[PDB]
Symmetry: D2
Subunit: 469 residues, 4 copies
């Protein structure tokens, strides 16, 4: 059972819109909205969305596997060895939010301070003492952004696994000589950095120039979660406020995906007339180029929705019914909707490009969707005794240290080879820390908002400093 | 009673070095070390210091007043109006960590997210609705570092008050016409930004080219806290590890100040021979240029300690007894002391330049001295009922809002016109948030380490995400 | 008769290799090598080439017309109006080296100092007094490189004409409202700058992603000058020194073009065995990325000449027979050929990217090919009386001014609507000035070197300052 | 006899203002204005000046010697060795326009292309073959501005000599070990680059913080050329156009110097009332910060001429009688005087900061003063036979090469150890080339304009390309 299996299972339920029944779905932690900072929902006037991995949740591991296969085929097409074709995507290896160290070719799981939690070179998990040769202080400078690449999104899962596959392959293939910073192949030297860049370029290529979008849209039922509650929730949002879409995807792809997401023989509720997807939005904006969108952005363009091409020129006109925008900036949204940042709840899956940047640059309210949480919560509750044991081992304070390392490993392995998205044993990950700091609300799915009234006061406890406690 | 009065009062006590007595001083919160992240003191191998406002705590309000007077005199000398000479420093106005908005000429107290807590234009405190004209989302982009200047250090207290004095003066002087972004004086326009830059330049000038250092060293007893426990604590540190100084001040000034700090008729304890200050340090480094120090730094130079001039050339030799360094980088410290970052506890008063930068760039352990905490703790305990009332007003949830604003104001005024360093009512300041995030330990004075054994395990509770709780 | 007709006519002659006959071809200025700075040919140890418009001279106006047609079709495909399809390339309009002013949408012919010689808005030639509104000092800041784009190469001829066609079209089409900096189309505004960028992008697109290369290679006889003397001259160069190719084109295209250039039923001379083109070069380097090539360059790669793909990795091996390089830098050439800059004669057609940059950055000796010179010389000699009259009108110095403007116009029109590449009347162009300053030698074709012995001393008179004369 | 002796000798002559007598002074090349590009003086509407080394020509070698002595004393004061105090300025060593190579510690005389003409390491003149170790192509990349510093101005003469003195001293002092890129002094390494920066900093220091200005103004007759024809010429300029001053010097110094330059017991002519210097200018601007002045400049300020301090604020008012400006940009001049660039003749001594930048950035007309030309012309005519012999040796073309090197050396030595400002033998210097390219007119002194009517047409021959000749 993958995280998307859980989400599609919950998607197959029709909404019992009885108020006591609505409250009741929160009986499961799976259906809750979690709160880092208090948020009075009655103050939200605009609900903003992105599409990819938020409205359109790609099915796992099928979609990752497709991305992986196509990225591999692109690398082979540009001259990587044929052996790459024998790789096959393994969903048990990657966890999201890992850092690829381009100097030494390691995948690292780090905390908020850049401290090393896990280090894998290919499929070799390097124990603490061995990591000290390359990381003398068990630490990386996180924002040495030329050296370290943070794999933030679900789109990065295939390349997370591929990077490890490639390092493993080249290390164990006798044609190549392993060196500190890459591989020697006679009179050719392939640095981990150049290899990484080839992988990044190939992933971008499959999405923008290759066949990934075409193959997705060919079999939407295989690749995209569909939920009749999505149009319902969106209709309720539009009754109390304004609704907008700001997607990094282009119009033609957005139209195909959104059409599928709304393709039911009814509108918001069974028995109601079907309405086009565009009717659910007061403002539709594509080619957003987030995170740049939240700064200077790009010139505002208008999409010709008949051809899917941009009209020539900068668009200087007003918000009109049926207009679709391209580019622009977050100020375009605020201006056209008559909103200030704190009147906006932006629902994002990109912790950096949606959530951190909208919060920090614009003071928007934020809702982070974390699709894996569905499965992570299951593991978290199912294996509660392991964490509980770890806590009491940490408490017990006058060997033992090695029992802590044992229990940490067993707990971590329940999630996969790279552990929980949120922690390694008792240490929180960078990702966890960024969720807490920048996501006002978070959940497995934004659909969970269906189970709360729009007057709800989401509450978090006031924080006190140690000297105040 | 100022914060420095408290510190000098505690300084006048001789250390009763009986172990039960040592533990007992922590009876007062005043003498405690506060813990944001756990720290096992037995793992610390190097204790690092800065001088200004850490080892050499300048007396308040005398030192701020001197800086203020000299900065005013410098502005008048370059052609500011004579009326500036009638200003007089008022310690009740400034709180540290405020942000000067150079566009609109406001002092702002903000939270970690850039949300406005307090806004004063001159001495006019602008209420929430009036702030919306200039700050439509009650928010600033914090790291628009060209527009906003964060007044982080105790050295910035005089200019915090002076900026408000200047805005008040020009606003109410009929020769000047108030405009949105500054003042018109016939055919001359003085922007708030150019005014701010003149103030910054004048403060730097008094410290580096003017008479402030000369006047300080003329009357050290008036201007600098002196404590016989300082040599004692430093001697205990050097028995268990290495001790270093990395100061942004120059050698001649450092030597004068440090000589005074160690001028007792004994060494570490009464009855022991006096030893020179330099003997307490394994490494002494001046002209550090923090925060650049924690990145590329500057070329390593050697001080000629007889003349106080730098020797000509880059210093390429080893660590030897009696050598004094200038410039260099944090790597100089690590290399020469045989340390990794996590073996170092750096004791700083500059939340950005000492603590945030050493933590983020190098993974050093951090101890933040907050001289005002002595007085803030007194107010915090003395007026506990006001905060308690605020908490219960916030709790009480089905008018009232205006009672919250009332009680918030009364609480805040107990600290001064700009409120507590750490909060406005129930909202934490940027400064508070940065202390929690980057200072592993903090206290009113690093001398509080005297009351803990060097095997002590400083403990903070493990943090859990909302879905984990 | 186009310039390429002259070059192909001279190309059809077999070389009479008798020494008196060889000297005799210089009887015509058409066959001479012109000298800006003295150059002793015996000191040249390496002869370097580029391919496009040097070895492979594209036929005119057929090749420009093809580029124009394909660029137009690309613009229409992205949504420019259908009327673009009625444009047809006119070789009589563009002269090379014009500057497009992206602010005001003008093509400008300028001197070395940025003084305006000609200004055309669309097909409207703006007289001197009217230019003062937009150019108050009849001057542009040349190296405001964001505003002004210099159309240096023969590849830029189609876009030179297209820019004028577009400005003319939009100006005279009633759907658009002409504004100072572009065109208004209802709620869309198309700046001259955005229009220019679309044109630049479309020209790059047709060359790198579209069908231009495919259509060229489909009909090489229509599009490329072929000359049996090319292999002869190259063989003579390789007898006295080393020969290299450094082209911005890729290997697959280079191989197709070079194969055609060498496709005769003999080698260097009639009766000799045919040899592959690669055998004429000691070093072959593609994807050069000039002008960056003459600075840091890019990593050195090796071409797999069987597949035409790059091998994976940086190439660290030596110069070997049959190796083909990609990327690298000018230092790659020097190192592998054992050359210093002044031992190298680089034969280029790009005044900036080949000639100015190799001279200024590396002190290479330079030979500039100027394909138009064949036709320009014909006009220059044929209409000598007009220039002579202008000179004597300028001399005659005590009306007249307007006769000078008349004769200047008649002279200029003999070359085309934008005049001579080298002048407008008595004023030299930027291009002329850059040829004189950076091209040690220049000619209509590098084949003209066939008519000089390799011991020849090319001589230019020593320059004296006015006070030295 | 120094160049300033010639200028002061000509300064002592009263102007015989008879028209035939005025023309007659041009009998001597010393009194001519030389022409690189034609200039119709009737079109000049504004005459612009700088002060230092143009209006105020500092006497040689006294002024250079003073700068040298004070710079040496500053270096010794910061800790350079006492032996520096035994250096004494030698006017026979430096020529202006040399390039200091900070990597290898050489003074280089180069041509326009960066080719090496002379290379001296200390006082050791390195012959051609020995230069190849450090300069393999006998070439430098001129605009590697971090490595190479061009000593353009007469203010740079002392440091030109001092750099050679320092390299010579450290090389021959047994305490120091000579290395490729500087000197080792035990555990201190002094790079040529750090040494150079210390020298540059010390020269700036003596001018802006030290005693050079004070010592100059103490003995103006010793240090500054004074000429009764200066007020006469300026008065004639103001009768036909506008006159402005744009100086990099501050107001207080400008006022002292200009007062001295105008201190005669008469105004423009004997018998006329004396007028203050300021009355000769329609616009006076100090603190110009050329060359930045010709780009964005700095904010426009107003000088309080009573105190010599700047008024607080940006000056937004109009041009009024008696106003003195500070900062601003070249656009300030154009706007306030109602001028376009080609209506302005700017009279400068800084080939880069006055002449190249005003020409290239603004299309101003340019007049370069070259104080040394007075003496260079004397040598040029006196030793004409040596150059003539060189020309005929170069002509004679079928040993000899070594006779050319001999005669080149003898010619060069007539000017000093670093040869003529304008050439080494038959090769022109960078400086000569920049004079020709950017200075429309040039002369030993701008006073030479007194000998030409303001309707004069300065004529230069039209330039032809080799193929046009
Ligand atoms: N999740 C992320 N993905 C990619 N880049 C990131 C991420 N978080 C931070 N960065 C980049 C942006 C900055 O250049 C740099 C500094 O990060 P750092 O200040 O340590 O993190 P933070 O949580 O305080 O957020 P921010 O970077 O916005 O300040 O790292
Ligand atoms: N206390 C401070 N004083 C001065 N500048 C600061 C301070 N804190 C942060 N900055 C600067 C450095 C960065 O350019 C910018 C970004 O800040 P931000 O990321 O919002 O804060 P932070 O607490 O995450 O620390 P950091 O800036 O190191 O990432 O602000
Ligand atoms: N022919 C050209 N094409 C494109 N850019 C040019 C050309 N010539 C010069 N430039 C660019 C490079 C510089 O950024 C800028 C400065 O030019 P400028 O100094 O006036 O010309 P130049 O003939 O002295 O050559 P250079 O630019 O190399 O110094 O213009
Ligand atoms: N006389 C000079 N003094 C100092 N810097 C100079 C001088 N001449 C040119 N430069 C600088 C400015 C540029 O960064 C760089 C490029 O010079 P280069 O293009 O070779 O000379 P140039 O005679 O064409 O003038 P320009 O530099 O203005 O283009 O050198
Ligand atoms: Mg998304
Ligand atoms: Mg300090
Ligand atoms: Mg070419
Ligand atoms: Mg000057």
């Amino acid at each position: 059972t993958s995280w998307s299996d859980r989400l599609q299972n919950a998607a197959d339920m029709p909404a019992n819109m009885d108020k006591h029944a609505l409250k009741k779905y929160r009986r499961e932690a799976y259906h809750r909205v979690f709160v880092n900072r208090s948020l009075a929902m009655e103050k939200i006037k605009c609900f903003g969305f992105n599409m990819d991995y938020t409205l359109a949740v790609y099915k796992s591991p099928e979609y990752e596997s497709l991305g992986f296969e196509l990225t591999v085929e692109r690398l082979v097409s540009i001259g990587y060895p044929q052996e790459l074709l024998s790789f096959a995507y393994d969903s048990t290896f990657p966890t999201r939010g890992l850092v690829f160290d381009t100097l030494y070719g390691n995948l690292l799981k780090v905390d908020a301070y850049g401290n090393l939690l896990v280090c894998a070179h290919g499929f070799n998990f390097i124990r603490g003492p061995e990591t000290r040769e390359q990381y003398p202080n068990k630490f990386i400078q996180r924002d040495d952004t030329e050296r370290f690449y943070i794999l933030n999104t679900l789109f990065n899962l295939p390349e997370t696994y591929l990077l490890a596959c490639l390092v493993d392959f080249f290390t164990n293939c006798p044609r190549y000589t392993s060196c500190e910073t890459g591989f020697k192949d006679g009179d050719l030297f392939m640095s981990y950095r150049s290899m990484f860049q080839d992988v990044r370029d190939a992933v971008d290529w499959v999405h923008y120039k290759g066949s990934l979008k075409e193959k997705t849209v060919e079999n939407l039922e295989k690749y995209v979660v569909k939920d009749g509650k999505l149009p319902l929730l969106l209709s309720w949002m539009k009754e109390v406020g304004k609704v907008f879409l700001a997607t990094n995807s282009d119009y033609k792809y957005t139209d195909k995906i959104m059409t599928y997401l709304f393709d039911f023989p009814h509108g918001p509720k069974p028995g109601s007339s079907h309405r086009p997807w565009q009717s659910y939005f007061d403002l539709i904006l594509v080619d957003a180029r987030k995170p740049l969108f939240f700064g200077e952005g790009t010139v505002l363009r208008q999409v010709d929705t008949k051809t899917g091409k941009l009209k020539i020129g900068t668009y200087t006109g007003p918000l009109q019914h049926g207009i679709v925008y391209s580019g622009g900036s977050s100020d375009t949204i605020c201006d056209l909707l008559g909103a200030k940042g704190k009147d906006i709840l932006y629902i994002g899956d990109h912790i950096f490009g949606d959530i951190l940047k909208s919060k920090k640059r614009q003071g928007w309210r934020t809702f982070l969707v974390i699709p894996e949480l569905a499965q992570e919560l299951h593991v978290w509750t199912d294996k509660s005794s392991l964490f509980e044991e770890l806590q009491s081992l940490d408490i017990f304070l006058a060997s033992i240290q090695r029992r802590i390392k044992k229990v940490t490993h067993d707990m971590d392995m329940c999630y996969g080879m790279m552990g929980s998205l949120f922690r390694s044993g008792s240490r929180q990950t960078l990702f966890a820390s960024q969720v807490m700091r920048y996501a006002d609300l978070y959940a497995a799915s934004f659909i969970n908002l269906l189970y709360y009234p729009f007057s709800y006061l989401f509450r978090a406890a006031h924080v006190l400093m140690p000297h105040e406690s």
